[model samples]
Target: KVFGRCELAAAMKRHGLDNYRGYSLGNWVCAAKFESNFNTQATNRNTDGSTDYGILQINSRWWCNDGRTPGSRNLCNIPCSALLSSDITASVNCAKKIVSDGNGMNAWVAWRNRCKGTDVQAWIRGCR
Candidate 1:
């Protein structure tokens, strides 16, 4: 099945994370599974009803504040779908930044230290 383990490994490779494995990819896939169920086209509606779109659920208003529209400048722009569509690498890098401020994989580290043995709810609460 497309949603099986190999598909996720392929997706991670396609996103340029080929070096990741074991707990690293496991943690990332865990987060991705929770966030978007590995759905590239997934989107979420915020409490205020604003749309946060794409696999990473980036908010349009927060990332695209200059009014130039989403997709105008690289994948770091306000509209997340624009970012994801513009460049998957950039989108992944941006996600890494949100996780660790350009440091090593903070999310993975967090998951390792805080969520490894917990349920999803506990993982989310503890990691966050």
Candidate 2:
């Protein structure tokens, strides 16, 4: 699923990402834009051989078990495949756990490079 900007904004807000862990909904929307272009099935392979899965580009090395990343932690306690689903509940929940683990929004380099210290509100400006 490739979400429209405001569509993702509204959906994420519904999923409780609005001010989640002090990061606003726009922050999440901005991250998703750079991370996966709002595509649910997006994936990227890291130089370390670990894969990033789904719109959030969750790493198999620490968040989900892909069974391929060495030293996988599976902190989200879910299969990496789950993150690719159109149903975003698992991925969103895992993201909260990641923030809860003290990573804040810095867990995603994309967020730091693009979303942080910026006017991310434009990402969700017209959304209700």
Off by over 4 Å in 1: 1-4, 13-23, 64-75, 83-87, 102-128
- The digit string of per-residue lDDT tens for model 1 on 33-67 reads 65556566666655654455555555554443234
**Number of the top candidate by TM-score?**
2
- Which candidate should be chosen as best, given lDDT against the real structure? 2
**lDDT to native, each model:** 0.49, 0.93
Q: Which stretches of candidate 2 lie over 4 Å from their true place?
A: none
- Could you give me the TM-score of model 1 versus the true structure? 0.53
- Lowest-scoring 10 consecutive residues by lDDT in candidate 2? 98-107
Q: Write the per-residue lDDT of candidate 2 for residues 1-128, one digit (tens) a residue.
A: 99899888888999999999989899999999999999999999999989999989999999999988998999999999999998889989999998888769899999999989999988988788
Model 2 TM-score on a 0 to 1 scale: 0.97
Which residue pairs of candidate 2 clash? none
